[PDB]
Design an enzyme around this catalytic site. Structure first.
Site, PDB file in Angstrom:
ATOM      1  N   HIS A  61       0.825  -1.231   0.000  1.00  0.00           N
ATOM      2  CA  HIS A  61       0.000   0.000   0.000  1.00  0.00           C
ATOM      3  C   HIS A  61       0.848   1.264   0.000  1.00  0.00           C
ATOM      4  O   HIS A  61       0.416   2.310  -0.511  1.00  0.00           O
ATOM      5  CB  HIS A  61      -0.949   0.039   1.209  1.00  0.00           C
ATOM      6  N   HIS A  91       5.669   7.053   6.395  1.00  0.00           N
ATOM      7  CA  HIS A  91       5.394   6.619   5.037  1.00  0.00           C
ATOM      8  C   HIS A  91       4.851   7.793   4.257  1.00  0.00           C
ATOM      9  O   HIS A  91       4.644   8.861   4.827  1.00  0.00           O
ATOM     10  CB  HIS A  91       4.371   5.486   5.037  1.00  0.00           C
ATOM     11  N   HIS A 116       3.538  11.073   6.247  1.00  0.00           N
ATOM     12  CA  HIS A 116       2.896  10.806   7.525  1.00  0.00           C
ATOM     13  C   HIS A 116       3.879  10.197   8.496  1.00  0.00           C
ATOM     14  O   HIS A 116       4.387   9.090   8.257  1.00  0.00           O
ATOM     15  CB  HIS A 116       1.730   9.833   7.323  1.00  0.00           C
ATOM     16  N   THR A 195      -6.139   6.813   7.465  1.00  0.00           N
ATOM     17  CA  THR A 195      -6.648   7.067   6.119  1.00  0.00           C
ATOM     18  C   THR A 195      -6.693   5.811   5.249  1.00  0.00           C
ATOM     19  O   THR A 195      -7.038   5.888   4.083  1.00  0.00           O
ATOM     20  CB  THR A 195      -5.811   8.117   5.386  1.00  0.00           C
ATOM     21  N   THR A 196      -6.308   4.662   5.805  1.00  0.00           N
ATOM     22  CA  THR A 196      -6.492   3.363   5.120  1.00  0.00           C
ATOM     23  C   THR A 196      -7.240   2.448   6.074  1.00  0.00           C
ATOM     24  O   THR A 196      -7.229   2.675   7.285  1.00  0.00           O
ATOM     25  CB  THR A 196      -5.163   2.654   4.747  1.00  0.00           C
TER      26      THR A 196
HETATM   27  N1  LIG Z   1      -3.077  -2.639  11.747  1.00  0.00           N
HETATM   28  C1  LIG Z   1      -2.944  -1.353  11.263  1.00  0.00           C
HETATM   29  C2  LIG Z   1      -2.954  -0.275  12.141  1.00  0.00           C
HETATM   30  C3  LIG Z   1      -2.820   1.020  11.652  1.00  0.00           C
HETATM   31  C4  LIG Z   1      -2.674   1.236  10.287  1.00  0.00           C
HETATM   32  C5  LIG Z   1      -2.531   2.620   9.766  1.00  0.00           C
HETATM   33  C6  LIG Z   1      -1.629   3.497  10.358  1.00  0.00           C
HETATM   34  C7  LIG Z   1      -1.494   4.791   9.871  1.00  0.00           C
HETATM   35  C8  LIG Z   1      -2.262   5.210   8.790  1.00  0.00           C
HETATM   36  S1  LIG Z   1      -2.091   6.858   8.169  1.00  0.00           S
HETATM   37  N2  LIG Z   1      -1.997   6.765   6.564  1.00  0.00           N
HETATM   38  O1  LIG Z   1      -0.836   7.371   8.643  1.00  0.00           O
HETATM   39  O2  LIG Z   1      -3.297   7.569   8.488  1.00  0.00           O
HETATM   40  C9  LIG Z   1      -3.164   4.335   8.197  1.00  0.00           C
HETATM   41  C10 LIG Z   1      -3.299   3.040   8.685  1.00  0.00           C
HETATM   42  C11 LIG Z   1      -2.663   0.157   9.410  1.00  0.00           C
HETATM   43  C12 LIG Z   1      -2.797  -1.137   9.898  1.00  0.00           C
HETATM   44 ZN   LIG Z   2      -0.642   7.698   5.677  1.00  0.00          ZN
END
Ligand SMILES: Nc1ccc(-c2ccc(S(N)(=O)=O)cc2)cc1
Ligand SMILES: [Zn+2]
EC number: 4.2.1.1
Length: 257
Positions: A61, A91, A116, A195-196
């Site tokens: 991803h 990331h 992020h 956001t995922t």
């Molecule tokens: N198990 C798990 C826990 C957290 C995430 C996850 C962590 C950070 C973000 S984001 N893109 O930084 O908002 C999106 C998803 C993904 C998978």
């Molecule tokens: Zn992110």
């Protein structure tokens, strides 16, 4: 099986993750004129001097640069936050074209990419616990525009050929994430979500006003990554961003006048 394709993209996520249509989803458009200065907001405290990067991973991803978060080594404090948040990974999200790629938008403007830096609230003991809490995570979001190179990003860019495909990882020690910050720590902040998938509503978002500039060559190298695993049909890792979600009953606060 969620992803960013025609058949598994953001408009499909709600079927497996009903919270996709929740009350505090991210990202959002930041309407700069409606965001209100909050004089009670403290300066951000970004303390990355003792950061220990370990590994870089293509998870299918995005790619994550992962840190040792078993001690208070790289932490975010202050701003809207109560307590101490530990850096676990950073990331990016990016586009197929320079005119798109960011998740947050600013007065509907899309940037070429968005960084992020993900942190978890140490009062919850570990990351898995933290994501189950409304104040579990703090994600520092930084916009990328295409112009001059970001010298501090080059070490990341240059390792990407070794993690081209989903599930590949590489040693990535002694990377200093301070080299990815803009000059100013002026920010907007609001309560939101991952956001995922799993789209958990556990994030205090802190989005910096000042973008960093990266070169066209740097972002081109992001675009050479693959969503697929090795030995699978090549699908370029591009446009791995979720579009802006309804603000609903939220106010975006500004740290600056
Ligand atoms: N198990 C798990 C826990 C957290 C995430 C996850 C962590 C950070 C973000 S984001 N893109 O930084 O908002 C999106 C998803 C993904 C998978
Ligand atoms: Zn992110």
């Amino acid at each position: 099986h969620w992803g960013y394709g025609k058949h598994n993209g953001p408009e499909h996520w709600h079927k497996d993750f009903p919270i996709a249509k929740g009350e505090r989803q991210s990202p959002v458009d930041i309407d700069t004129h409606t965001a209100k200065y909050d004089p009670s907001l403290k300066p951000l405290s970004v303390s990355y001097d003792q950061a220990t990067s370990l590994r870089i991973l293509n998870n299918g991803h995005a790619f994550n640069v992962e840190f040792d978060d078993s001690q208070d080594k790289a932490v975010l404090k202050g701003g809207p936050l109560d307590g101490t948040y530990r850096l676990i990974q950073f990331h990016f999200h990016w586009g197929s074209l320079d005119g798109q790629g960011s998740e947050h938008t600013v007065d509907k403007k899309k940037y070429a990419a968005e960084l992020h830096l993900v942190h978890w609230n140490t009062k919850y003991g570990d990351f898995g616990k933290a994501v189950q809490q409304p104040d579990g995570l703090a994600v520092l979001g930084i916009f990328l525009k295409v112009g001059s190179a970001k010298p501090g990003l080059q070490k990341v860019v240059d390792v990407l050929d070794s993690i081209k495909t989903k599930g590949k990882s590489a040693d990535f020690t002694n990377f200093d994430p301070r080299g990815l910050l803009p000059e100013s720590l002026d920010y907007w902040t609001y309560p939101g979500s991952l956001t995922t998938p799993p789209l958990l509503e556990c994030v205090t978002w802190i989005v910096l006003k000042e973008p960093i500039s990266v070169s066209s060559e740097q972002v081109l190298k992001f675009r050479k990554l693959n969503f697929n695993g090795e030995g699978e049909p090549e699908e370029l890792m591009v446009d791995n961003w979720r579009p802006a979600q309804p603000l609903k009953n939220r106010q975006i606060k500004a740290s600056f006048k």
